[PDB]
């Protein structure tokens, strides 16, 4: 956790950086699924909260063995033309800590209507009256649009950075690099 | 005075065909003759069109055909005969100084890496490009590159790349007729979605006859990414050869008219006032001449 690897987005004359970010995030998700482990933290060094911008720089946080296992994986092939890869340097000691969390939303009422059909055996009009169409959740959070190998539907994954703390305790990490209770340093 | 003609239309060189798509399996690509074609299907999410590779396939088979014409200096439509003669003389001096050498190397590079697979190359773990020089219906000189070794941002040298480059230079000079069948193979994955050209059901995709395909102008734009001599900053790589260096992805234009770097001012003072520009800049001017245009005053 003491080390970090920094990825900068090369500007692209054919693609805006958002879909490049989505592609690389899917590649690192596949790399972490293949590699395993629960000590991989993500960071957005230039996250703009004014317009919910993802940013043009990426920071991944891991240990030395985890970082060399990640860079040894051949997922990096086919993406070197658009990114920078620095060195697994030690993170600065006086750094505030913040958490990253995947915030999902119930933006589609018909999914929950189908769910309550499978839970309470209600009819179509019962679910229509019980759940209006205005219950959609709109999030002013940065997001990435990806499709999964298990389910081919394209899903949107919101990423939100927590408040700055002064210390961090041990926690877990998901397959996306998002923390289920962990923290990443800010610098 | 020898002013610019009011009509100076140029026909395009390096004609690209519409790049088809097909579905295939890796290590079987040597028999790529009757593979099935990727088809755009309708799935309601609102109705949208999507195109994805079949289940028992991991390789895309984007194939197209390229004609290298020559005679880039001759306009199809002109008004002033003196201006046409002066422009032809200027192009003749450019050809005599270098015989389409560097431009052909860059075009051969852009053919070598499957940049014409726009969104089918970033997510592919292995991309292979096969280029044939077909003559009288038979392959006279076959090439086979790997797109990963040839980067999108550097223009290196290679023996096969030099052979393809001298073929392109012979085509652009007019010493012969060059026909290239370009077949590209990319390991996009099992069942991963492909990205054909988009047509204007909120969004619909391009097809020619029950088969997804890429527009010819997209392949031409990918082959025009040879411009590296613009005042580059923030580390941008090669951009498509356009007048006023326009890039839609960045939303801004390099080679502004305020600076002495756009195609029109260099063309003018190169053929009107005889101020020959730099070798890289004149390469850019000849690239604009090769791509064609509707140039000319009003």
Curated annotation (Swiss-Prot), chain A:
Changing residue 29 to K: Cleaves pre-crRNA 130-fold slower. Disulfide bonds: none annotated. InterPro entries: CRISPR-assoc_prot_Csy4 (IPR013396), CRISPR-Cas6/Csy4_sf (IPR042564). One of its GO terms (molecular function) is endonuclease activity. GO terms for biological process: defense response to virus; maintenance of CRISPR repeat elements. The active site is at residue 29. Its EC number is 3.1.-.-. Changing residue 150 to A: Cleaves pre-crRNA 350-fold slower. The record marks 148 as: Substrate binding. Changing residue 49 to K: Restores biofilm formation upon phage infection, crRNA forms. Keywords: Antiviral defense, Endonuclease, Hydrolase, Nuclease, RNA-binding. Disruption phenotype: Infection with phage DMS3 inhibits biofilm formation; disrupting this gene restores biofilm formation despite DMS3 infection. Normal biofilm formation in the absence of phage infection. Loss of production of crRNA in the presence or absence of phage. Disruption of the entire Y.pestis-subtype CRISPR region disrupts crRNA production but does not alter phage resistance (possibly OLNs PA14_33350 to PA14_33310, plus the flanking CRISPR loci), indicating this CRISPR is not involved in phage resistance. Changing residue 102 to A: Loss of pre-crRNA cleavage, still binds crRNA. Changing residue 29 to D: Cleaves pre-crRNA 910-fold slower. Transmembrane segments: none annotated. In this bacteria, Y.pestis-subtype CRISPRs do not confer resistance to phage DMS3 or MP22, but instead are required for DMS3-dependent inhibition of biofilm formation and possibly motility. CRISPR (clustered regularly interspaced short palindromic repeat) is an adaptive immune system that provides protection against mobile genetic elements (viruses, transposable elements and conjugative plasmids). CRISPR clusters contain sequences complementary to antecedent mobile elements and target invading nucleic acids. CRISPR clusters are transcribed and processed into CRISPR RNA (crRNA). Processes pre-crRNA into individual crRNA units. Absolutely required for crRNA production or stability. Part of the Csy ribonucleoprotein complex with a probable stoichiometry of Csy1(1),Csy2(1),Csy3(6),Cas6/Csy4(1)-crRNA(1). A Csy3(6),Cas6/Csy4(1)-crRNA(1) subcomplex is also formed. This is CRISPR-associated endonuclease Cas6/Csy4.
